[PDB]
Amino acid sequence: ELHLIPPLNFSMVDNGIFRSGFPDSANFSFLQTLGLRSIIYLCPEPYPESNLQFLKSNGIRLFQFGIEGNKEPFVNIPDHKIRMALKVLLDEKNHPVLIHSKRGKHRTGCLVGCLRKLQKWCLTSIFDEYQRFAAAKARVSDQRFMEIFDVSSFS
Numbered sequence: 001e002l003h004l005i006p007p008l009n010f011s012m013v014d015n016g017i018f019r020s021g022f023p024d025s026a027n028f029s030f031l032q033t034l035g036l037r038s039i040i041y042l043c044p045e046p047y048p049e050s051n052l053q054f055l056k057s058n059g060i061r062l063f064q065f066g067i068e069g070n071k072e073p074f075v076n077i078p079d080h081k082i083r084m085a086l087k088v089l090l091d092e093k094n095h096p097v098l099i100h101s102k103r104g105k106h107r108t109g110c111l112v113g114c115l116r117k118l119q120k121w122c123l124t125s126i127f128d129e130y131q132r133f134a135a136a137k138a139r140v141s142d143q144r145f146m147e148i149f150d151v152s153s154f155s
């Protein structure tokens with residue numbers, strides 16, 4: 001009975017932290033197995049009724065930090081929104097937490113890369129993980145955002 005379907009680009013980031021693209025009803029039975037307390041949602045669009053009923057049924061808190069989905073070379077990742085998401089991500093009371101965007105590549109990739117910088121990973125190691133998810137859609141601007149991200153306020 002091969003029946004569980006993780007959401008698009010699903011991965012475990014760390015103890016209590018997951019990343020993916022946008023979950024749909026086919027992914028709900030899999031997400032139930034994780035015992036989520038929180039979702040960090042990085043798109044501005046309203047959450048669909050299907051997903052809201054999943055959250056309500058499972059007692060999952062929704063944190064929305066809407067980042068516009070821009071394309072290179074006109075990408076302007078908002079530092080403030082990433083930092084608000086990081087503040088929630090670093091509070092273990094919110095774990096287990098799923099970070100998701102639409103595809104789990106750009107917005108999700110930036111938030112995870114900034115977590116890795118706080119975890120003292122080498123930039124080349126952060127970029128390698130970012131590229132594994134983003135694949136042919138890897139953006140230099142996402143990696144430059146991580147390069148210049150000042151960790152001072154979170155250490």
Ligand SMILES: O=P(O)(O)Oc1ccccc1
Pocket residue numbers: 069101102103104105106107108109137
């Ligand atoms: O910002 P996201 O993680 O949703 O990732 C993408 C990547 C390519 C196109 C749209 C979205």
